[PDB]
Design a protein around this nucleic acid. Structure first.
Ligand SMILES: [Cl-]
Ligand SMILES: [Mn+2]
Ligand SMILES: [Mn+2]
Ligand SMILES: [Mn+2]
Ligand SMILES: [Mn+2]
Ligand code: NA
Ligand code: NA
Length: 327
DNA sequence: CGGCCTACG
DNA sequence: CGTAG
DNA sequence: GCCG
């Protein structure tokens, strides 16, 4: 079992679902208390279990597995013995956890905002609605649309949304392309948002594209919310439904064709996979990776990539298709 | 022990 | 501060 | 919380 998640296939579905879910509760809880290191370890340990070829049935099967020490091993031990880990259940039940989860799930609210609101004694969505003078425009949108945004986005929704984005992109800039990214590209059947990456085969033609796309979607009556030389737009779309509609989070991202493979890689995820890939790149290969490129700080050069395959090769990693990047 | 991804709005 | 994967 |  390699130590970095980018060095091993991680399928969407696996053989240790219960165990990984328990560790991810602890990861999430650590994030709520500002401990990113503990979040990372619990996330990595969970991801290791996702990568195993069969279920863990005994404690001995953890021996030698990366990211399993005293704490994560105890969590697994208690689940194997009793079907439940008391620490995990204590977190699930805490007012702190439930409220921080509720608040941080609001679009426009991060851990810091949620925590300050928690400390001020606020607990419910109606508590926030009663004092809306404090809220940002983004948080107001997040709160108004919260119910719809909690409903899973389905594959049918994605196909509908892709068509309308293509229509607007085609008018904004003939020849421009739209690629589905994020969780749906990794094979997920549901999600909480749809991610698209837009480019054009002629380098430079994509300049100024996103405002033109946004203005056109706005005029078609499809934009319930957006933030406005920008390249990422976090929107709430109005998606047609039987006799009605629902609000759906959509991210639209633009990259020049030179950067497309890096942007595609970054935006396809998973979040943990990409953090691990960037960590690997820097620590093991001395190369700096982001969604724009891959930089050699010795030679002071950028690696030209024509594909995701190119990027894995330049990092000395076996290629993983998107459906094996579910770390 | 230090490090933990790296960006844009 | 928020957002993204 | 774990690793390297
Ligand atoms: Cl016991
Ligand atoms: Mn997504
Ligand atoms: Mn998104
Ligand atoms: Mn996300
Ligand atoms: Mn994400
Ligand atoms: Na949030
Ligand atoms: Na850019």
């Amino acid at each position: 079992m390699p130590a970095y998640a980018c060095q091993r296939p991680t399928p969407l579905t696996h053989h240790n679902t219960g165990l990984s879910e328990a560790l991810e509760i602890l990861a999430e809880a650590a994030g709520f208390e500002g401990s990113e290191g503990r979040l990372l370890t619990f996330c990595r340990a969970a991801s290791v279990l996702k990568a195993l070829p069969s279920p863990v049935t005994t404690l001995s099967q953890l021996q030698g597995l990366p990211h399993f020490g005293e704490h994560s091993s105890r969590v697994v031990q208690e689940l194997l013995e009793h079907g439940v880990c008391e620490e995990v259940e204590r977190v699930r039940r805490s007012e702190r956890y439930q409220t921080m989860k509720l608040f941080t799930q609001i679009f426009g609210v991060g851990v810091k905002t949620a925590d300050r609101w928690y400390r001020e004694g606020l607990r419910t969505l109606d508590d926030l609605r009663e004092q809306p003078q404090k809220l940002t425009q983004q948080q107001k949108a997040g709160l108004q649309h919260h119910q719809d945004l909690s409903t899973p986005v389905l594959r049918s929704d994605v196909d509908a949304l892709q068509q309308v984005v293509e229509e607007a992109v085609g008018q904004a800039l003939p020849g421009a392309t739209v690629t589905l990214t994020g969780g749906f590209r990794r094979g997920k059947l549901q999600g909480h948002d749809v991610d698209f990456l837009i480019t054009h085969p002629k380098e430079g033609q994509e300049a100024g594209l996103l405002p033109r796309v946004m203005c056109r979607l706005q005029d078609q009556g499809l934009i319930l919310y957006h933030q406005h030389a920008f390249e990422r737009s976090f929107c709430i779309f109005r998606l047609p439904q039987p006799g009605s509609w629902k609000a759906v989070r959509v991210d639209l991202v633009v990259a020049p064709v030179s950067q497309f493979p890096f942007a595609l890689l970054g935006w396809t995820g998973s979040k943990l996979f990409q953090r691990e890939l960037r960590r690997f790149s820097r620590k093991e290969k001395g190369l700096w990776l982001n969604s724009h490129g891959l930089f050699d700080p010795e030679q002071k050069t950028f690696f030209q990539a024509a594909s995701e395959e190119d990027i894995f090769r330049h990092l000395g990693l076996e290629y993983l298709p998107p459906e094996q990047r579910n770390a």
